[PDB]
Amino acid sequence: WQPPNVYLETSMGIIVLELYWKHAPKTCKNFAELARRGYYNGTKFHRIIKDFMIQGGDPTGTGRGGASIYGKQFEDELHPDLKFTGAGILAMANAGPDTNGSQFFVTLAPTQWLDGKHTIFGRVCQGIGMVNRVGMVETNSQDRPVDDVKIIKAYPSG
Amino acid sequence: PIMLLSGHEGEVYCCKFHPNGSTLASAGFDRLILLWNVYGDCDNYATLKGHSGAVMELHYNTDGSMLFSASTDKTVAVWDSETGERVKRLKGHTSFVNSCYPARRGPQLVCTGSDDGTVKLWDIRKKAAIQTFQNTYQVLAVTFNDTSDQIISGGIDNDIKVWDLRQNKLTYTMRGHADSVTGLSLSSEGSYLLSNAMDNTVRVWDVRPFAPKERCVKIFQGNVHNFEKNLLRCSWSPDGSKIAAGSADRFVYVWDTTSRRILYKLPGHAGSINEVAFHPDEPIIISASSDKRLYMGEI
Amino acid sequence: EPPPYGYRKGWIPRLLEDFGDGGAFPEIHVAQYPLDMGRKKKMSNALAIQVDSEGKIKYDAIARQGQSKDKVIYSKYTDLVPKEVMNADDPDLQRPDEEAIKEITEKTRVALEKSVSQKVAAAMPVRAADKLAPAQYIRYTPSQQGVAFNSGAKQRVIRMVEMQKDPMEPPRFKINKKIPRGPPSPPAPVMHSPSRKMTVKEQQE
Amino acid sequence: AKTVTKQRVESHFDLELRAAVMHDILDMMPEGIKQNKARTILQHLSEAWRCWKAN
């Protein structure tokens, strides 16, 4: 059960992410079953690092929420050759390893630093000009942007 | 709610409830004792007067009718809560009286710790001293034993001591405190005693006909001291369940006996909390802090 | 298009076309730039083009420009359109009940009276001065953190004292300075009916 | 913000009479779209007064 490109048609425009189960099967199943679960409706982008990262996907929207398909969290599915070397790196970040939950990050540029601290799981095969637009927008001092941006529709590929 | 209390000229050092939990006692530097209604809107009615130095300890009886108070001005004093007026001036105490402890459900008597180098027994009726155990140094904390036949004391030697009222020599000495003894409290079991100390480590013991002879049972982390060296005071729950402490970090410390976890390290305060009172009936806490006010937390 | 998953080895897509409908190849050891992706761009002054939660072009931002979420800024036609009401018994047509009213009375009275009495004591000018209030004790957490400054402590606790004002001291500063009036507010939008130009006849009348 | 005393009573009556006129019609019953010639309706008003006074 690996939804190839999962659609999150966000308020400002669509996104679709292809996750490589061969590279990241576990968080791939997490993201597939999660988008199919639709519990993401109402996630406000929980962090905006302009031109570096876009991160969201928390039922809390503060940074201390989010739970997985497996309980609270699961381990990472770490890769040898997959990097955050460019925009559209879709990897759920951790505040400590083996604690990956519901919050999802989407890169905006080369982020080779969190490689080895985040299992890079795939890429946004749709909505990347929109991702640049989003990573442009003005955020407050706490990366919850002044714009309350949420996804319209969260679902898998068929 | 939040229910922060105020009205004190200075820091609040000592706070407790009615052994009913009907009216509330707080006091500190101001050399008088404020009393309140705990419920309603937390109303403030009456203030005891007289005590020349900072009232170093308030102590109820266990029913809630008479009031003992050890003040730094060389004296302990008895007062009628019915009135607020002093029944006795237990004088004779040669220096700063820190602590007072009236025996619960036993005959009328108090054991008093002070800044002289003595532990003193006194009677409410005679205006006379019953005993005095000179170990060598000022006595900072005193709590009885539930038979009222031993006297527990915490002083400056980190060596928690207990006297036999009848054999009059050092009955129990137990050691393991990393620095000076600052607070003693006998749980409602009658058996376990709770002790705080600035050394960041607080201890539990059990004073029984038999305890393992090395009775350091439970230990809690978090209490702080600083260049202030203010008085530190602790309590059990009325159920012997939650360990209540204050400290000089502005964090009130709420632990459990069982898992010894941090149940709460609660902020809110501006001053160093100098006493926590648990309600004899309610999940109600009053935090007497050196920010010249109080808190009443509901948990 | 993009070579298949498991068959994407060996090539590095550098022009955004090899993304097909988009996509980064995380296992391909390059910075992936499908559809303007990857590049930190020139810092240009267009403010965030937002969109409503239905997908429209919310010029309410251009209206409320540089203004807080308190301001009501009517610039939609759905404000121009006449609502209809027929119930003298709706919630819409009901004032706040006197409990809120007495609350707001008490708050108003309080803040009012404090600002009054400060402006009134202005007409004291001979202040029968009260003395200097108790000393301030404040805990300061510098944002500068480092072992070398404050000789290694992460906080400083500071005593503020109020310095005496000399009684026989005239005013100190030239208060009467004139400048033009500051720029007003973000202009409101003119929500007017369609205006009609007059006949030249009328004009001559 | 000086009071109106005894020497500014006539001057003030006219400040306010001709203000009131300029509020009154020459900007609230126009439809002389261009630029409503208020400067000239005020000239009529002062000549109407001279003619009243001279009969």
Place this chain on the structure above:
Amino acid sequence: RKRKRGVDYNAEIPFEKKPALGFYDTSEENYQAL
């Protein structure tokens, strides 16, 4: 010299308001001279 508003003109834009920007690319825009 003592000219209190004289030089407000040859020196600086006297009382300045920066044109407010909206929804477009204004930075790299600039203008040629006389």
Place this chain on the structure above:
Amino acid sequence: WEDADFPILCQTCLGENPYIRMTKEKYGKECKICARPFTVFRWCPGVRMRFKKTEVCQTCSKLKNVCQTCLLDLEYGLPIQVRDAGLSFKDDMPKSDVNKEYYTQNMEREISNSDGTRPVGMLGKATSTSDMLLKLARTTPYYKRNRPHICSFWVKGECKRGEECPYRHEKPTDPDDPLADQNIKDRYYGINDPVADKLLKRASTMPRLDPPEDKTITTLYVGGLGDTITETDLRNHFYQFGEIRTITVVQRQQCAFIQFATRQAAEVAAEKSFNKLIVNGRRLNVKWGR
């Protein structure tokens, strides 16, 4: 006038003892910037060290984000001319009397709509503190600041008060030095600060990586490697910073050579890496190879 919670100054100006003592006077004197009355808090700097006082309006401070006593920036701590240019920053603060008063008035009006956390305006949209600023930034508290003046008596001989000369009884500086007479208003306006020009000369002569001649020299020699390094670690140093074409880790000479896939990527990695690409603690030298 203004009303404050406490001053804004660097650690150097701020002090050393854990308990600082400062006295407050409301509407004490005139910010030479806002020109109007301010509050004045006076801090005891150090043992026998000159008591300082707050010397600018708190709004006059939040304007440029500098020290209300120390006068240097609060993040780096170099002359404001420098710090601005190190952000490439270009402020339009007006200068003439009426223009400046109008500017100050509307400035305080616009700053009244703030939350008291950070300077207003381009002070955030220039927050890319360049390693140039980071490197010109002083490291330790140059606490010579709180030493007194030259006791003009004690310069001529006269300071007959014993050791209590109110001022450091040393040799007075020859004012021929450009580091002598910097008018406080000019130093605040970023107006021809000779100390700032000295910082410009220093940050111009300070070592940075050099460019080669021909574009087809896309091999980059990193000198001083050591045998704790990996080829994948040299990569992760220079890998997502562009694309690398190849790398030769010379273990017979303790160096490296990155042949790149983007010239500007090579420039980014290497020039940012000059002597400061410190992965596992070894001072590598980024250059363009032969």
Place this chain on the structure above:
Amino acid sequence: QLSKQYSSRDLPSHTKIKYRQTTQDAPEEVRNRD
């Protein structure tokens, strides 16, 4: 920027408000009346 100038007319005077009493016409009787 609060000046110390002053006025003969701004001296304190008439510092109590006469409240409308029971017999005159208090807002209570106005609450009642027909």
Place this chain on the structure above:
Amino acid sequence: TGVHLDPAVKEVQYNPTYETMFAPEFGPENPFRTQQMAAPRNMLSGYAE
């Protein structure tokens, strides 16, 4: 996850347990912050209480 408190809100009226008060936030630190721009400050340059 259950009740946690917004770390930027300091006026919080519900009595938080240990984790219900000081649960740590998910994600990385903002590298765009000068130490001053990372530190919690009530004032421009450092918090006072």
Place this chain on the structure above:
Amino acid sequence: TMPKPQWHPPWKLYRVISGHLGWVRCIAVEPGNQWFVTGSADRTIKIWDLASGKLKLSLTGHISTVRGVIVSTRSPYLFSCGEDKQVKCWDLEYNKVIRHYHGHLSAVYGLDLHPTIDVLVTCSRDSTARIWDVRTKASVHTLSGHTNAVATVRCQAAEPQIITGSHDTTIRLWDLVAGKTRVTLTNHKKSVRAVVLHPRHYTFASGSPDNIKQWKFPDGSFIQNLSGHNAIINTLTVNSDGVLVSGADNGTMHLWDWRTGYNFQRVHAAVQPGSLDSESGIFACAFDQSESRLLTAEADKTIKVYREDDTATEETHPVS
């Protein structure tokens, strides 16, 4: 369209009081309903008995046109406001001025009282309003932001507490304690000289030569137009029973239904004997406290009092 409006009876002229020597510009009623008070452009403030219309007393303090008067519900005070830039506080137990609020810079076009606290609002031609503390004569707040004469001001206890309509043709609702403008309504095309608040409906109307408009508190949302009265509108005054009187400046006064917006009556009185016909115009309207009588203050120096018609029925006066 709308439901069908309630049928209200008509009103008929029944008294015409004549004692003033210049335009009569403002009118107000006692709390307890014994007397009303007129302030006129002959600079006097007259106090008339409301039963018989006899003049009980005339006070002369002002230097020019009295442009507004009001009487305090909480204290034995009358507050007058004039074109001499002065606002006066008459105490009615000696019949004497006791208090004067100084600080406006041009004629004071109108004035209102807060019903709960003791504060005063006055609007003037220097394009500002001011909030005075009744008791210490001090300006607590200067509501600035309009850009022309602030023709009228009303205050209420609910929120927002202060509504000013001006001659730059906009309305502003102000926060009192904050002392600044919440909402700015720019729907009218010509100067706004009258605004009124419903006694029991959290709603308010605002008139201009274009058309009356109805709006909804507290954020000022459009509700309906009311049209037909195409003349400079000097007064709006609303009954308890949904009667809304709109009196204009060319003499005519129309009566409407507050709710459906249906103008059911049109009165055109005749000027006092020696007046020109261009000296017909209405400056003030007021319902009495029984809300049975309607007084009007006219540009021909008369006070015209209208009463409710007791012998008409829906079949005498069909509703359209």
